[PDB]
Amino acid sequence: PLESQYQVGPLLFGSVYSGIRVSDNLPVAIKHVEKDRISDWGELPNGTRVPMEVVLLKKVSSGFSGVIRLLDWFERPDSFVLILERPEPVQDLFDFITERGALQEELARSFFWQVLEAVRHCHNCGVLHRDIKDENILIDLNRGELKLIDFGSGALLKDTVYTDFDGTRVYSPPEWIRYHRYHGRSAAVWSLGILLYDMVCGDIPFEHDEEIIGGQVFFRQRVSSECQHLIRWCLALRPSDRPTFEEIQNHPWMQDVLLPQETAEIHLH
């Protein structure tokens, strides 16, 4: 029983509703996914064919708070319904950067570090998100914790070449623009570079295909040299020239990160 377990509220295109689990008044998000619109499918351990998004959410569901938790799912004649965690109070990182403009580097450091841990968590679980961007990152404003959301463009992590993609073009790497291929980790690092520039300059650096493949990064905001260098490194044109996740977290700009609660007390309360 789906409508008998959740009190459904208002919208949050895309069809996600605010909800409360009647059991315990827990805030949830209720996401509807039309079967006709589903790119990749997967099979659950039961063999029950489900959307790949459900498969990926289950593989990352193991307890670490950096990734959105899938709480339940239902099948309907023409759709799947996903019951997802909803922090409250919350704001996604896109609206947060819109309202506040370029972030202080201290705050961008904490956020970016939390995104890095969350993406490491996905990869450790065999999951490639493929749509990292500020819109797909939620800020729990009281805990100061970031949540990665919307795995609807993701895929199982593999080491061979990808030739499909359904993420956000302005966050896709030049090898996707030019040759329709990429490898998972190095394409994720590129999108992390776009994300980092987005945090410290107040918007993404590239809107057009020629800018993406141009390999030129102009800084519109005062940004420290160490941060510019990390950004430029993540945005290396050659995928093999990009840093590993470990190289990113050992970079000098990434040292002395704030704890989530410090981040909430200093920058969010």
């Binding site: 896109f94 749509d131 961007k133 359904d166 993420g167 956000t168 073009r169 302005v170 918007d203």
Partner: peptide
């Protein structure tokens, strides 16, 4: 300069 969301 107009900042915008970008559908996937």
């Amino acid at each position: 300069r107009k900042r915008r969301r970008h559908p996937s």
